[PDB]
Symmetry: D2
């Protein structure tokens, strides 16, 4: 799979498990079209969102549902979600890992981009 | 002002100057309505976006034009922009600082909410 | 003052108040000599650590007592402390801000070096 | 192995490869005794530093040689290194991943602690 999402919890020192993730792709009319969704596993990783064939060039938005995560654990966090928006595959196919480290009032995110 | 935005550059160890920032408020029909905007100053800060009277409870989005910032430095970045989405609550402390720390392939954001 | 330390709490979205900070300078024999210390204020900031005359070029260590901070909040943290080690250079901008953002199992640190 | 170190580069969007790492353990006389060392692989990971038998209770310091990393790439960074100091195994053996995300004037670090 050319798109993976990994989420860690900076309060517990653990993977962030069961985090809902929704991916969108910008359509020709400039709207966000639903593309794929899933939830992180016990390792904090979400695999299998898409395929090389379906992950064409485009502008993608990876929405990480951080508020639902913290609220499911009884914490009242600051952000509604974390959004990661990027152009993908504009120089040919690449593999993308979108990582995020969560705290109730802060998050970090980075990307690892590799050429298969 | 109840809302301030600060942007820092982790590559050069400096404020991120002249970064465009747009603030939106979520409307009843679930669309994003323009609310306020500006460019960060020489200190990386953007003051005066709004007033206590105008900054009512609701859901707000702060969009930071990180791509244009890096492109002006001759660096090709990963993200189209950085977006910070949050609910303003009256119960909470009154003043909101939204800080972002930028690298070409990474950003962090935190909220400092105080009296 | 050429050196300021700022500490923020990512769990509560607030300054980290009353955090002990110790600064050391590396001596010729490679040991760490005490240089300055204090506690962060209600704004999470520690000002007045040193002067331009005293802050000569060299290697400095800023140790932030993060463990005591979390323990006072009833939270068990991972790190013994956070340490920031850097060289002061005269060529560079004059004023150094060392910022740290704290969570129980994580911290970030950045330097803002300006004129 | 119960201790792993992973390092990423936030400028390049890639693993941080060939980063030197030195681990120390506080001795009874309060000095930092050398414990293990190595360098990150092409994946940004450093495996095999120690064993369950030799990784006893103690206070450990993981020194990540960030300045040498950036300088080997011709960048002049702010920090001399990144130091991660923690008590390990005080409630029995655990597995520790020490992660770090590097920029020239900033770094983040987190831990993932699991119970085998
Ligand atoms: C002021 C500041 C410092 C750091 N830092 O790295 O020390 C940060 O990460 C952030 N932030 O927004 O996440 C803000
Ligand atoms: C910083 C970081 C740490 C871990 N980690 O395992 O702690 C990761 O897996 C990743 N990543 O990209 O997948 C990044
Ligand atoms: Na192209
Ligand atoms: Na014990």
């Amino acid at each position: 799979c050319p798109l993976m999402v990994k989420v860690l919890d900076a309060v517990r020192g653990s993977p962030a498990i069961n985090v809902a993730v929704h991916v969108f792709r910008k359509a020709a009319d400039d709207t966000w079209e639903p593309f794929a969704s899933g939830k992180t596993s016990e390792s904090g990783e979400l695999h299998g969102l898409t395929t090389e064939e379906e992950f064409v060039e485009g502008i993608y938005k990876v929405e990480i549902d951080t508020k639902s995560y913290w609220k499911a654990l009884g914490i009242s966090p600051f952000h509604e979600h974390a959004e990661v928006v990027f152009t993908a595959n504009d120089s040919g196919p690449r593999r993308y890992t979108i990582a995020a480290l969560l705290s109730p009032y802060s998050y970090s995110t980075t990307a690892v981009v590799t050429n298969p």
